[PDB]
Amino acid sequence: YMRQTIIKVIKFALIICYTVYYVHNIKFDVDCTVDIESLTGYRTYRCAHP
Amino acid sequence: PAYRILKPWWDVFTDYISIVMLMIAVFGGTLQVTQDKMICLPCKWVTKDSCNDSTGPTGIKYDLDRHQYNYVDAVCYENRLHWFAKYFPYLVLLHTLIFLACSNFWFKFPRTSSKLEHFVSILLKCFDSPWTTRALSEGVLDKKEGEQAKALFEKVKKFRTHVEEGDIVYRLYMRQTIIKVIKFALIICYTVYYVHNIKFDVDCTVDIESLTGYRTYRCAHPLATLFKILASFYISLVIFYGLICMYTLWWMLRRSLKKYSFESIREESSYSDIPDVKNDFAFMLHLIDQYDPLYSKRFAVFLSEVSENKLRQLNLNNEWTLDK
Amino acid sequence: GVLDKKEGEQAKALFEKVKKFRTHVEEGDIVYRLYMRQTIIKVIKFALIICYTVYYVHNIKFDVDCTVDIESLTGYRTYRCAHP
Amino acid sequence: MICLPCKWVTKDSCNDSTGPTGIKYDLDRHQYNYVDAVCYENRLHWFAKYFPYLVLLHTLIFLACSNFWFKFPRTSSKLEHFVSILLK
Amino acid sequence: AFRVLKPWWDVFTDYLSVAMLMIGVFGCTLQVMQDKIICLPKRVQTVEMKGLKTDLDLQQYSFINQMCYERALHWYAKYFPYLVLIHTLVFMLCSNFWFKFPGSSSKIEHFISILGKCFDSPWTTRALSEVSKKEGEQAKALFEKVKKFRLHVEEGDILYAMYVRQTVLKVIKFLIIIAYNSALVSKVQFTVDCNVDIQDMTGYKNFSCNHTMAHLFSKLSFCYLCFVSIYGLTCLYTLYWLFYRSLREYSFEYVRQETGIDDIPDVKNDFAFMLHMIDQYDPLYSKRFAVFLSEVSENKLKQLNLNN
Numbered sequence: 001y002m003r004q005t006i007i008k009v010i011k012f013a014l015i016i017c018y019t020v021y022y023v024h025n026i027k028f029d030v031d032c033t034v035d036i037e038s039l040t041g042y043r044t045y046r047c048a049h050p
Numbered sequence: 051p052a053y054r055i056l057k058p059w060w061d062v063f064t065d066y067i068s069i070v071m072l073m074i075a076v077f078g079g080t081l082q083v084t085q086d087k088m089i090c091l092p093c094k095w096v097t098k099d100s101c102n103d104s105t106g107p108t109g110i111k112y113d114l115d116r117h118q119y120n121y122v123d124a125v126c127y128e129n130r131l132h133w134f135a136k137y138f139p140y141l142v143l144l145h146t147l148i149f150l151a152c153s154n155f156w157f158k159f160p161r162t163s164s165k166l167e168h169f170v171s172i173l174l175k176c177f178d179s180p181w182t183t184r185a186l187s188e189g190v191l192d193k194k195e196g197e198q199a200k201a202l203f204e205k206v207k208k209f210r211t212h213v214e215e216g217d218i219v220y221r222l223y224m225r226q227t228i229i230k231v232i233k234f235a236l237i238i239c240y241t242v243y244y245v246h247n248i249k250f251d252v253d254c255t256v257d258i259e260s261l262t263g264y265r266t267y268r269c270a271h272p273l274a275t276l277f278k279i280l281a282s283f284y285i286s287l288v289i290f291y292g293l294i295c296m297y298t299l300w301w302m303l304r305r306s307l308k309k310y311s312f313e314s315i316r317e318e319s320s321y322s323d324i325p326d327v328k329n330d331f332a333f334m335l336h337l338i339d340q341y342d343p344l345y346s347k348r349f350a351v352f353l354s355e356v357s358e359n360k361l362r363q364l365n366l367n368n369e370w371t372l373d374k
Numbered sequence: 375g376v377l378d379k380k381e382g383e384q385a386k387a388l389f390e391k392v393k394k395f396r397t398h399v400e401e402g403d404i405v406y407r408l409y410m411r412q413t414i415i416k417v418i419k420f421a422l423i424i425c426y427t428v429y430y431v432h433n434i435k436f437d438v439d440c441t442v443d444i445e446s447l448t449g450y451r452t453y454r455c456a457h458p
Numbered sequence: 459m460i461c462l463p464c465k466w467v468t469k470d471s472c473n474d475s476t477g478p479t480g481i482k483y484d485l486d487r488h489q490y491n492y493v494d495a496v497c498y499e500n501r502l503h504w505f506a507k508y509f510p511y512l513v514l515l516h517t518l519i520f521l522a523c524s525n526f527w528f529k530f531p532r533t534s535s536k537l538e539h540f541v542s543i544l545l546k
Numbered sequence: 547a548f549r550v551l552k553p554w555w556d557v558f559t560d561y562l563s564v565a566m567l568m569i570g571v572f573g574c575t576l577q578v579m580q581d582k583i584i585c586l587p588k589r590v591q592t593v594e595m596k597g598l599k600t601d602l603d604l605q606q607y608s609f610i611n612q613m614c615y616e617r618a619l620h621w622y623a624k625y626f627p628y629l630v631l632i633h634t635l636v637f638m639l640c641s642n643f644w645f646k647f648p649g650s651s652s653k654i655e656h657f658i659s660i661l662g663k664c665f666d667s668p669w670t671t672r673a674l675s676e677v678s679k680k681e682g683e684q685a686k687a688l689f690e691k692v693k694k695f696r697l698h699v700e701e702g703d704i705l706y707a708m709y710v711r712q713t714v715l716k717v718i719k720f721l722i723i724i725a726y727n728s729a730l731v732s733k734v735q736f737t738v739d740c741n742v743d744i745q746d747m748t749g750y751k752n753f754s755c756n757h758t759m760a761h762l763f764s765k766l767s768f769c770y771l772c773f774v775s776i777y778g779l780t781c782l783y784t785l786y787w788l789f790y791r792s793l794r795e796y797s798f799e800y801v802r803q804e805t806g807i808d809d810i811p812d813v814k815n816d817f818a819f820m821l822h823m824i825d826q827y828d829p830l831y832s833k834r835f836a837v838f839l840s841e842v843s844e845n846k847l848k849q850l851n852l853n854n
């Protein structure tokens with residue numbers, strides 16, 4: 001029971017750290033420069049992640 | 051549980067009709083959410099906001115994009131499709147929920163539910179009592195059966211003192227039946243009067259000329275005839291739900307259900323001291339008779355003081371045996 | 375022979391229950407009539423179903439020639455529809 | 459329905475008359491959808507459109523007929539009585 | 547079985563919570579739909595009418611749709627079902643808070659258990675017949691149990707305060723929900739004017755959009771408002787029943803008039819509140835319990851057993 005609680009709290013800490021750090025990367029407007037000019041004709045695009 | 055004996059044939063029929071109407075509501079709601087749309091084509095030649103309706107045949111070019119078509123469809127679905135053809139399944143769902151609540155209100159309302167549970171429990175234990183078989187057969191008695199019969203007799207007296215003064219169950223059932231026929235009349239009127247507005251061809255004039263280029267459009271509502279079928283089927287079921295309910299009203303007003311006479315039972319069986327019961331006791335025994343009259347018979351022996359005296363005498367023979 | 379007392383009274387009470395159930399049920403024939411009516415309805419329904427279903431099964435065709443007079447909206451009068 | 463117009467007609471009937479090239483009808487996607495809807499509603503036979511619903515109705519009535527005496531209280535009470543006494 | 551302590555208001559609020567949960571789930575399922583808003587640009591470049599060629603691809607139209615859905619559609623019209631889900635979860639959690647507390651549940655079970663022991667005891671109707679062998683011993687044992695209950699539950703007042711707390715929480719949540727939903731129900735509109743600055747991507751700056759299920763969300767919001775209004779009226783009646791008369795005290799004076807026993811005292815606090823609860827359920831239970839509460843009746847039972 002002690003090991004289960006300790007794992008459940010250390011994983012809690014890791015989850016909070018990595019989730020809070022990367023939560024700002026969920027953006028609506030995203031610029032992509034993917035270099036597919038030979039297939040599309042354009043290099044840069046402005047996507048909207050719904 | 052064991053409330054099936056408290057539900058006569060009309061209640062079972064109305065419950066099954068409510069299940070079928072709920073199926074109609076779910077099917078229509080799924081169709082209206084998923085595939086309900088309009089396919090609107092602009093009228094090229096207009097005559098005062100009305101379609102003029104005028105070498106091989108070649109297609110008419112409207113110059114609209116796919117999204118202009120979608121915008122026209124959405125606008126002529128919101129503004130010109132009749133409200134019945136749009137909110138029919140939700141109205142059906144609301145009506146079914148109100149019907150089910152009315153049918154099952156007294157099973158949830160505490161004052162009536164307690165009395166119904168008490169009645170069904172004592173009647174089941176009385177019908178399954180061996181003392182009923184022994185008395186209707188008219189000294190051998192099992193001891194545990196002995197004080198079981200005595201305690202059940204005392205419980206019957208308790209129940210008669212506890213339920214017979216009031217008529218809340220009868221009044222609640224009357225009000226439920228009255229609501230279930232008033233609502234049926236309103237449903238039939240407003241559904242028959244508005245079913246004809248579910249059409250396949252809809253002419254819409256929405257004034258989106260600044261965004262599309264046309265004012266009047268001719269639209270096809272594909273899921274309309276099916277909605278004309280389901281509604282008709284619904285109007286069938288509600289009519290049945292009406293007629294059955296009306297019979298229930300007749301069954302509750304042809305005679306007084308707050309007075310039950312055991313005249314036939316004391317006519318056939320020996321115990322002629324069996325009295326007549328009133329109020330919720332009478333109404334619930336009438337409901338029991340609608341399921342199986344024998345359930346009343348095996349109950350009646352538990353309402354008699356002569357049977358109480360016979361049970362007391364035989365029990366007194368039993369526990370005070372000759373040896374002690 | 376040997377007889378547990380509970381078994382004996384249960385046998386006698388079930389004999390009397392047989393008599394009571396007999397005089398309760400033998401008077402009427404509601405169950406038989408209901409079963410008769412159910413079978414009759416189920417056979418006449420089968421007759422109607424086989425009739426109208428065999429008669430109209432030929433109308434389920436893949437290719438349907440439709441003529442709907444929407445020439446003022448489409449420009450064509452007759453179309454050749456496929457029903458997948 | 460997937461309805462293509464008949465270019466060659468003869469009194470409301472399809473006339474049916476180097477490399478091949480596609481026939482151009484000059485119809486939008488939405489005109490095609492409207493034609494499908496109208497010919498499905500008016501010219502597809504009612505059996506081909508409502509066969510499963512008729513089958514569902516017929517099965518529901520068949521199952522109601524088969525299980526009516528088990529649900530009708532007058533017969534259900536007697537059947538439960540007989541089953542109980544026979545099993546005991 | 548705690549159903550004997552659920553009055554009509556509690557059952558009604560539970561069913562309203564179930565209905566509101568159904569509304570929220572249906573709204574979320576409607577929100578699942580991909581086609582949400584449809585936008586056409588403004589000022590695009592017998593009478594034969596011709597269509598306006600907006601000169602836009604399908605991807606440009608979809609981009610305009612999502613841009614105007616994110617930046618022009620009101621947040622209420624996009625997140626109303628989720629708010630309904632959260633509110634109905636709070637209502638369901640805070641409607642059973644009196645029942646599911648650790649110390650309260652044991653008292654509730656003890657009260658209903660010994661009250662059922664009363665309602666099935668022969669000594670109750672025997673005691674009414676007194677007023678108007680083995681069963682005597684069971685009567686004496688149940689009487690000791692009744693005294694144990696008196697010394698066990700009557701001291702505290704956790705049940706009444708906890709029920710008052712949950713009722714007040716229901717009332718304030720209802721008030722907040724009604725206020726903000728009635729304020730923001732006017733924002734669920736079919737026609738929306740979107741003015742996102744995507745002239746560089748599409749060519750246009752002003753768009754007229756239609757929210758396809760704005761009518762459905764408006765009807766759902768009005769139905770949820772009606773359900774919450776009924777819920778709040780029920781909770782206000784619960785508050786009125788809680789505070790119009792002192793539920794911290796219960797007078798057995800009605801039994802004092804009916805039953806000839808006058809030694810029957812007036813219990814208080816949690817005893818009083820649960821007696822009021824079972825009176826809402828069934829008034830016979832308290833009247834039958836009173837003949838077991840009094841101790842001069844216990845002396846009469848002791849004398850009867852002594853003579854027997």
Ligand SMILES: CCCCCCCC/C=C\CCCCCCCC(=O)OC[C@H](COP(=O)(O)OCCN)OC(=O)CCCCCCC/C=C/CCCCCCCC
Binds near residue numbers: 085571578
């Ligand atoms: C633990 C992992 C869980 C993940 C498992 C995923 C299960 C389902 C995966 C397969 C999905 C199959 C579809 C995939 C391709 C999508 C096809 C598509 O775009 O169809 C459109 C259609 C939307 O229709 P529109 O065109 O907007 O209609 C407008 C006119 N009414 O897209 C779909 O929704 C796909 C339909 C498949 C249904 C699968 C389940 C959909 C999600 C259901 C969520 C409901 C939850 C509600 C409760 C939430 C709150 C408690």
